[PDB]
Structure 1
């Protein structure tokens, strides 16, 4: 994974909106294309809509899913099985 010497990566344009909502009190839905952004402690309790290439998937962030990436919760392939 990403070097610890470097940052904990959030796209700033995603993060900024989080803190904005935190101040005034949360929350509206946040449509983002930032799959690469880490879920960050400030984001918990929000519901962020993560674009998977097609649809924006509503993801309610929790205490368990902090360390992860946003993409991990909006799967990019439809697979219901074979035959």
Structure 2
């Protein structure tokens, strides 16, 4: 994991979007390719469409997912069995 002395990593373009939405109260999803951004407490209550390689999967941020990377909720491989 990222060192604690550096703090959590969030992309600036995504952070500005969530900050604008929270300053306002827009409910439309925020579309992003930033799978590597960490979910912050401010993220709670928002819908983020995370790119998974080919599509944008919507994720509704609940309190329990604070501290996860955004990409953990958008799987990138397809598998159903053999």
Normalising by structure 1, we get a TM-score of 0.95
Specify the alignment match of 2:30 in structure 1.
30
Preserved contact between residue 50 and residue 58 of structure 1 (Cα < 8 Å): yes
**Using the alignment, how far apart are the partners of 1:35 and 1:19 within structure 2?**
18
> Residues 36-47 of structure 1 correspond to what in structure 2 (within 5 A)?
36-47=36-47
> Residues 29-68 of structure 1 correspond to what in structure 2 (within 5 A)?
29-68=29-68
Give the 4+ runs in structure 1 shifted more than 3 A: none
Specify the alignment match of 2:69 in structure 1.
69
Q: In the comparison of the two structures, how many residue pairs are matched?
A: 82
- How far the C-alpha of 1:26 sits from its partner, in A, is 3.1
1:13-56 per-position Cα deviation (integer Å, ceiling 9, x unaligned): 10110010011113211110000000110010101000000000
Mark the runs of 5 or more structure 2 residues left unpaired by the alignment: none
RMSD of the alignment, in Å?
A: 0.7
